[PDB]
């Protein structure tokens, strides 16, 4: 659901009416096609109308990508790794992640047996 960076189109309310003139309907259909089919490409570009209202000084049309301010408060990777290591510790089976070290052995007749082998003996 991370939605940062998606395109957004702003149009005057009268463009979205059902009885609007054919020109506005064609404009809305073209906007829909653009939204559906725009991708990063060697021909990417836009020609967009631009009009700033004299009494508000804000563009009536707009084209921009949604932005976000804050950042996630928790790092999930570290927590997941910690809990995985905790799970692996319960069975004393850390060999799965740390490999077979030379200081441990799987033989019960050898004086380097690991805890996993000792419990399998039980």
């Amino acid at each position: 659901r991370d939605l940062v960076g998606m395109p957004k189109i702003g149009l005057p309310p009268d463009y979205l009416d059902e009885n609007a003139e054919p020109e506005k309907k064609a404009f809305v259909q073209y906007c829909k096609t653009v939204v559906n089919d725009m991708i990063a490409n060697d021909r990417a570009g836009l020609i967009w109308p631009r009009y700033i209202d004299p009494d508000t000084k804000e563009d009536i049309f707009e084209f921009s990508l949604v932005s976000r301010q804050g950042a996630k408060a928790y790092d999930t990777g570290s927590i997941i790794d910690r809990y995985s290591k905790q799970i692996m510790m319960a069975f004393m089976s850390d060999v799965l992640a740390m490999g077979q070290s030379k200081y441990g052995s799987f033989s019960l007749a050898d004086s380097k047996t690991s805890l996993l082998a000792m419990s399998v003996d039980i």
Binding site: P13, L16, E18
Partner: protein
């Protein structure tokens, strides 16, 4: 249609004075437009697109 025509009709007129009678119209357009954009231009119809 008639409302759009009436906006133009009102915007044109200005103050006048003949002996004894004096009419001031320079303020009508401000109010008329303020009402118009609030009650008509801002009313959305149809649906957005996702």
């Amino acid at each position: 249609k008639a409302l759009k025509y009436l906006l133009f009709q009102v915007a044109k007129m200005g103050d006048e004075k003949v002996g004894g009678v004096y009419l001031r119209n320079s303020s009508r357009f401000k109010s008329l437009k303020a009402v118009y954009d609030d009650l008509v231009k801002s009313s959305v119809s149809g649906l957005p697109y996702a």
